[PDB]
Amino acid sequence: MKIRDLLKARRGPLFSFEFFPPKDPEGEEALFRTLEELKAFRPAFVSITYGAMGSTRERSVAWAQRIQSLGLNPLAHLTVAGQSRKEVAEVLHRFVESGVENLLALRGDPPRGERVFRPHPEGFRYAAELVALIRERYGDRVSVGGAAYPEGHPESESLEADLRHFKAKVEAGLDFAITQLFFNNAHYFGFLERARRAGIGIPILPGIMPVTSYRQLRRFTEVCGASIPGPLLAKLERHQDDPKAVLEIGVEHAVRQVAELLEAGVEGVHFYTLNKSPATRMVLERLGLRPA
Numbered sequence: 001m002k003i004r005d006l007l008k009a010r011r012g013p014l015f016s017f018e019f020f021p022p023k024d025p026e027g028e029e030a031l032f033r034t035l036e037e038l039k040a041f042r043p044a045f046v047s048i049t050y051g052a053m054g055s056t057r058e059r060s061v062a063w064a065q066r067i068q069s070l071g072l073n074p075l076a077h078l079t080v081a082g083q084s085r086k087e088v089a090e091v092l093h094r095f096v097e098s099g100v101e102n103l104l105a106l107r108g109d110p111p112r113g114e115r116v117f118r119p120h121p122e123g124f125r126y127a128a129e130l131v132a133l134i135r136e137r138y139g140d141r142v143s144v145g146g147a148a149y150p151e152g153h154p155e156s157e158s159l160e161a162d163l164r165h166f167k168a169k170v171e172a173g174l175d176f177a178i179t180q181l182f183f184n185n186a187h188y189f190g191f192l193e194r195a196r197r198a199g200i201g202i203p204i205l206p207g208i209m210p211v212t213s214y215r216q217l218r219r220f221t222e223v224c225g226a227s228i229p230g231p232l233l234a235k236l237e238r239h240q241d242d243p244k245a246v247l248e249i250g251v252e253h254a255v256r257q258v259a260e261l262l263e264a265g266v267e268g269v270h271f272y273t274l275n276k277s278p279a280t281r282m283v284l285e286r287l288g289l290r291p292a
């Protein structure tokens with residue numbers, strides 16, 4: 001069930017989505033419904049977001065195990081921020097020990113209120129270090145993915161540096177990568193070519209977040225450094241007080257993006273659902289897919 005193999009032997013573009021482990025029963029109940037609805041569209045793998053600095057690691061392990069019994073293939077996210085190397089290696093072992101064959105090796109953001117990353121006094125500093133750890137201890141027993149930034153990571157000194165660091169991370173042992181969310185496909189195609197030019201040949205999957213609220217869009221882009229197309233921005237701002245109009249605008253925009261990506265031959269599309277199914281399901285259905 002390694003993503004590396006799923007990509008190579010695919011019969012068409014892979015559908016995947018991400019969810020985060022809830023912090024309450026109401027959250028769990030809502031997530032279960034979301035998993036049920038999206039599972040009907042046959043996801044190749046399902047990402048499990050890793051709480052900031054390991055704050056909810058036990059929950060990640062719990063869900064990595066739980067979705068397998070639901071017939072889903074887990075891509076367990078794992079960061080090195082705010083945790084000792086030992087703590088990281090431990091949770092990593094719990095994932096593998098639980099049947100997880102796919103890991104998304106990440107660094108994690110700085111603590112809240114801090115713009116410059118600082119590692120745990122006894123932890124890793126770069127995602128590449130975790131990729132190396134995973135390979136050194138498990139080899140090709142698991143498939144590893146990493147984050148890519150079409151518009152550059154906020155902390156990178158320059159785009160050239162951002163790309164060099166990504167290549168280094170790939171060289172550490174990545175089978176694939178998933179990009180930060182983007183709203184204009186040009187950002188993605190441009191990054192893809194910059195990558196190929198730099199000698200990177202691994203599959204780089206586009207990460208897409210269909211918008212369901214104006215605030216959501218503004219806040220997510222402000223934090224991740226992604227940009228908003230002027231036309232989309234104007235439309236969402238004008239209809240922000242209308243939940244239905246906003247959902248329609250966001251879904252249509254995502255449909256347009258995804259339709260072109262699929263025609264361009266991407267190997268798959270990764271959806272950021274924020275534990276909600278409506279937007280993603282509407283995009284898939286408007287693209288012509290129907291529940292199994």
Ligand SMILES: Cc1cc2nc3c(=O)[nH]c(=O)nc-3n(C[C@H](O)[C@H](O)[C@H](O)COP(=O)(O)OP(=O)(O)OC[C@H]3O[C@@H](n4cnc5c(N)ncnc54)[C@H](O)[C@@H]3O)c2cc1C
Nearest residue numbers: 049050077106107108109126127147153155156165178180
């Ligand atoms: C698909 C995806 C999934 C994500 N999932 C999660 C999640 O589950 N939990 C979570 O907390 N966050 C998650 N994030 C956010 C991510 O952790 C933050 O963007 C974080 O700030 C960077 O993580 P990274 O793995 O990209 O780091 P890195 O690749 O390590 O990059 C961090 C910074 O260090 C620089 N750098 C890298 N190597 C070097 C070097 N050798 N020398 C100098 N500088 C270097 C980079 O250019 C960059 O600016 C996700 C992001 C994406 C795109």
